[PDB]
Write a protein that binds this ligand. Structure first.
Ligand code: MG
Ligand code: MG
Ligand code: MG
Ligand code: MG
Ligand code: MG
Ligand code: MG
Ligand code: MG
Ligand code: MG
Lengths: 65, 46, 89, 87
RNA sequence: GCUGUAAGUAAGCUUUGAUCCAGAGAUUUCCGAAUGGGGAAACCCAGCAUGAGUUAUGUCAUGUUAUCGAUAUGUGAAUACAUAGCAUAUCAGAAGGCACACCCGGAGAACUGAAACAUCUUAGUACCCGGAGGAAGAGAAAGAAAAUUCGAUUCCCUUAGUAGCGGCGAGCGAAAUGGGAAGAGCCCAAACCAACAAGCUUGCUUGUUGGGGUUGUAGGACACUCUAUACGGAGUUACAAAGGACGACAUUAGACGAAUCAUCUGGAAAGAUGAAUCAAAGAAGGUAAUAAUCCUGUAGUCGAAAAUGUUGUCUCUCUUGAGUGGAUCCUGAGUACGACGGAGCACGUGAAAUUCCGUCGGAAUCUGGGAGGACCAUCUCCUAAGGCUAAAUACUCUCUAGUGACCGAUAGUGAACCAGUACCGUGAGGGAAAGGUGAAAAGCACCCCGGAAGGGGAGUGAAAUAGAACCUGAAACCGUGUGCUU
RNA sequence: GUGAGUCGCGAAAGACGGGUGAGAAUCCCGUCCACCGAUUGACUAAGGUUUCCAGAGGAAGGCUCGUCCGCUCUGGGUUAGUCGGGUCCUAAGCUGAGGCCGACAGGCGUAGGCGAUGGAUAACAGGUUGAUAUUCCUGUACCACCUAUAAUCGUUUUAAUC
RNA sequence: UAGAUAGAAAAUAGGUGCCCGUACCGCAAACCGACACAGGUAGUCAAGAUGAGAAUUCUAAGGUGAGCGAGCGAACUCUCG
C-alpha cells in the first residue's frame, strides 16, 4: 500500500484518514473490554495513517513549488 | 574610553609591591562638533 | 478530535454502580479541558447534558524486574447523562 | 543461506549422516536438522523434539559428496565444485 | 525470515523481495538563550488576524506578537527652526551552547625555594573574564650585521646553561652567524585631475566619489618618449576585486574472493598417525578439544542511483607596461622625542639602549629622519607615526583503519554487569560494592516426606560434590569420629 | 571469631472463652477489667508522597512468635460555576526598558511587573461506599453572562442611558 | 465630570460557567530527628460533678491496652511509703 495513495485526489486522502481513525478508535475502545483477540492489526492501521499524511504533506510541498 | 588603564605595580622607596592604575585623564564637555556629551581627554583638547 | 481526546474506557464495580444513574468513566489523553470532552463526546454519540466532572492521579511505583520505575500519569473523566444512554459492550 | 535442502553433518555427535533443514536462525548461527533429539520435558517424561547445531555442515548434489558451496556467477546463483545446480 | 534488550503467549507480515544496511526528504509534543506576559525548568495567563462548533456566549485549530541595533518611513517641539522622543516596517544580524584540550587579550595571587625573610623566586603559573579560529599569533625591514654582506615571518637543531641580569645569594637566561622544514608578497594615506556640494568674495577651498599613485642603490607627482588596448595578455575566487558553468579522484551501503580425505582416542576433533592441495590469500577470530584447505574472513580485483569533499579546463571575471628628466610639490602631527612614575625586552634603575602605558611639554620635511647597547663625530645600513596575508607549527570532545616485551576484575576509565547509579548532604559537591553454569537450556518429567522451603530417589548431560547464592574452591573459622594421651 | 548465647529486647494492666490454622501468651470475634479525657479525642494547614481499601502470601523487615501490618503480589480508589488558590489588589522584598556607574563580569535604580501570612469575593442540611464528600443525589438557594420577550428613551443633544 | 452613543429592560423563560488541589497520618509508627526512637511539631472545637478557674481527682464522647513474656520474690543500684 504505497501507490494506492498516489491514485487519489488530494481530497479523498482526508476521508480515508478519518474513517481509518474511527476504525481504530473502535478497536482501541473495545480493547480494554477484552472483546479483541487480534493484536497486530492495529499497527497496520496506524501505519496507514502515517502513509496518508506523509503523502498529503509531500504533495502539499510540490503544490507549493 | 573610561577604563582604569595601565594597572601595574607601585614600588616604594624600598621596593615593596602595590598595584595602581594611572587612571587616564577624562573630563566631560558639551562636544563642540556634536551637540551631546561624553568623557573626553585633555590631550585631545589642545 | 475525538480520537486523541478519548484514550480508553474504564470498567469496574465503581462504574457498575455508576451506570445506575447513567454515569460512565473514561480515561482521556492529558492536557484536555473539561469542555472539549463535552462537545466532542457530544460530537461522536449525540449524548449530552449532565455536565462532566473530572480528576487527575499522580503516578505510582512498580517493580516488575527488580528495577525501579513509575506508572504513567492518568487523567480520569466521569461522564453522566440525561438523554438516552450509550452501550458499546 | 539454506532452506531445507540436503547436507552431510560431518563434525558433530554422529557423522556420516544426512538430512534436511529447518530454521537457520541468522543471529545465533544455528540450524535445525534431523540428527539431534533432546529429551525435553514439561508438565512428559521425555518429548523427543529436534535441536540445533552450529554450521559444521556442507552440501552435496551432483558428486553425492560434501563440497565447499561456492556462490559463483550471476546468470546470483550457486555453482558448486563439480556441478552447478540450484541450492 | 521478522515482530530490539528480554524471555513467553497470541495475533499477524513476508520471492508482489519483508526485517536489515546506506544516502536524501517529511514529521520533529513540552522546558531550556526561551524570545507575547508571568514563572518555584518542563506549569499557568493573555493578546490580535483567520477559521471550526453554538441560536448565542463560553471552548478550540493554525499563524502572529520580546529586547538590542541598523535601515526606511511618518511624527515629533517642552521652543518657531528642529532636534531627545513617539508609532510602523525590513534583516538567515546578535544574544546562548561548548572540547576543563590548543591560541590571543584584560585583570591577576599564596603556600613554597631562599635552609628565616620583606628585594627576588614560585610566575606572569593558577583560577576568573573576554574574543576568534580550526588553527591562532607574528609579519614583508625606520632589521640583523661589520663582509666577497644578506634582504618577510614562524618552528626544529646548534651556538649556550656561553655572554649577561642578580640582597652578585637563591636563582634566571638570551640573541646573532650557521644547518634544516615551508617558501609570497601586496592595497591604502598624501601631493595631481574630473564630477557634484555649502561657503558661490563672481578668489578657490574645503565636503564626497571616481581615477592617480605606493618607496631608500631613494620613490612618486609634474614634463617628455615608446608598449598595450577593451586586450597581447597577465587572469588566480586562500591576501592582492568580487560573482558563476563543466570533467577526474576519495568518502558515506556492498560483492566476488584457491585449496582435504581417512584410522585411533573422544561425549565431541580442528590432536597423533598417514598419505594429498592453494598460496598476490600461513593476518585474525569462531567452529563440542589447539584448523592455511568447515564458516566468517584476508591478498587482489570490482562497485555508487543520490549526496558530500577535493582537484582539473573553457566558460568566467578583471587588468596597460616600461624609461628618461627631477625646475616645482608630496612622501602618514599634538605623532616622534624629553622629563616624571611604571611595566616589559634574559636585563631588578643600573652607565641602560631598543619597545609600550598615563600626566605634561613638544621637532624636522631629502642638503631630512632612525638605528648600529649611555652620549658626540665619521662611516655603514634602513625610511615609522595606516592596513592584509596560505604553508611549515601546537592540540584531539569525536570518526574511520590499525598497533602494544599495556591491564585482564582489590589492576585497568570511578564505571567490563542497567554507574556518575543506589547512597550521603539543604547545597555546592563526594561516591560505592557486584563478571564467568554447560558445548547446547537439553534449566531436574515422575514417586516419596513435607504446609511450604529443602531434601532423598528417578532421569537430561561425559561430569549435576557443574543444578542456578551454578568453572576451579585454598586459609581463617566451625564441626562429626577416631589412633595416642590427660 | 573472641567477648556471649552474655548486656539489651526502647516508660504502661491485662485475663478468660470460642474460632482459625500444619503450628498460637502475641491473629479475628465477643464478655469482663484497666487507662487519657485543655485529651493518647475530633478538623484542617505545612510536610511526606499511594503509606489509603479489598483479596491472597509470609523469603527477608517488625528488636520475640506471627495464621497479622504502615512488608511483598495482584487489583482498585481522590469528581467542585459557590471550598483554599489563579483569571482581583498590595506592603516588606525581588526583578527592573530607557538611564547613572564601573577593567571585564557586573553593581545601583525610575517607569512598570511579580510576590500573601493580610484586603474583596456567589451555599446550606441530610443521605451514601470496604475506600471520596459544601465535589456524587435529594431537596432547596445564589453570582456573572448570553440568547429570546415587553409596559420606559426621543437633535443623539440632553435625556432614559455607558 | 472629560468623553462614548440610535435608544434602555423593569420581571419573565432558557441556557452557558475553565485550571490546580482534594485519597491517608497530620502531639504521629507515615513530618525533621539514620531506627516502627520516652524529643520538637503554628492553628480551631474542647462536655459532666468539685472548684474562682482551661488548676486538681474521677468519668462522658470517643480512642488505647503501648510488639517479648513466664518463674522466684537473694545481693547490689534506682524509684516511692
Ligand atoms: Mg543567525
Ligand atoms: Mg622611565
Ligand atoms: Mg606618553
Ligand atoms: Mg578472581
Ligand atoms: Mg485464647
Ligand atoms: Mg499537600
Ligand atoms: Mg514520637
Ligand atoms: Mg471542666
Amino acid at each position: 500500500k504505497a501507490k494506492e495513495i498516489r491514485d487519489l485526489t488530494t481530497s479523498e486522502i482526508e476521508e480515508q484518514i478519518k474513517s481509518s481513525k474511527e476504525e481504530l478508535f473502535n478497536l482501541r475502545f473495545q480493547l480494554a473490554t477484552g472483546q479483541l483477540e487480534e493484536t497486530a492489526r492495529i499497527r497496520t492501521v496506524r501505519k496507514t495513517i502515517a502513509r496518508l499524511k506523509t503523502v498529503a504533506r509531500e504533495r502539499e510541498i510540490e503544490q507549493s513549488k | 574610553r573610561k577604563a582604569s588603564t595601565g594597572n601595574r605595580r607601585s614600588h616604594a622607596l624600598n621596593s615593596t609591591k602595590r598595584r595602581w592604575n594611572a587612571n587616564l585623564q577624562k573630563v566631560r564637555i558639551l562636544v563642540d562638533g556634536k551637540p551631546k556629551k561624553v568623557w573626553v581627554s585633555a590631550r585631545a583638547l589642545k | 478530535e475525538a480520537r486523541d481526546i478519548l484514550k480508553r474506557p474504564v470498567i469496574t464495580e465503581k462504574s457498575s454502580e455508576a451506570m445506575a444513574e447513567d454515569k460512565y468513566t473514561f480515561d482521556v489523553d492529558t492536557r484536555v479541558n473539561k469542555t472539549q470532552v463535552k462537545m466532542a463526546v457530544e460530537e461522536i454519540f449525540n449524548v449530552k447534558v449532565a455536565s462532566v466532572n473530572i480528576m487527575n492521579y499522580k503516578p505510582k511505583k512498580k517493580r516488575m524486574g527488580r528495577y525501579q520505575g513509575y506508572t504513567n500519569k492518568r487523567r480520569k473523566a466521569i461522564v453522566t447523562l440525561k438523554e438516552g444512554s450509550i452501550d458499546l459492550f | 543461506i539454506k532452506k531445507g535442502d540436503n547436507v552431510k553433518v560431518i563434525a558433530g555427535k554422529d557423522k556420516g549422516k544426512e538430512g534436511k533443514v529447518i530454521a537457520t536462525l541468522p543471529k545465533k548461527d544455528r540450524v535445525v536438522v534431523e540428527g539431534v533429539n533432546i529429551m525435553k520435558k514439561h508438565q512428559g517424561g521425555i518429548l523427543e523434539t529436534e535441536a540445533a547445531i552450529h554450521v559444521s555442515n556442507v552440501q552435496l548434489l551432483d558428486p553425492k559428496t560434501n563440497e565447499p558451496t561456492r556462490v559463483g556467477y550471476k546468470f546470483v546463483r550457486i555453482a558448486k565444485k563439480s556441478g552447478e545446480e540450484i541450492k
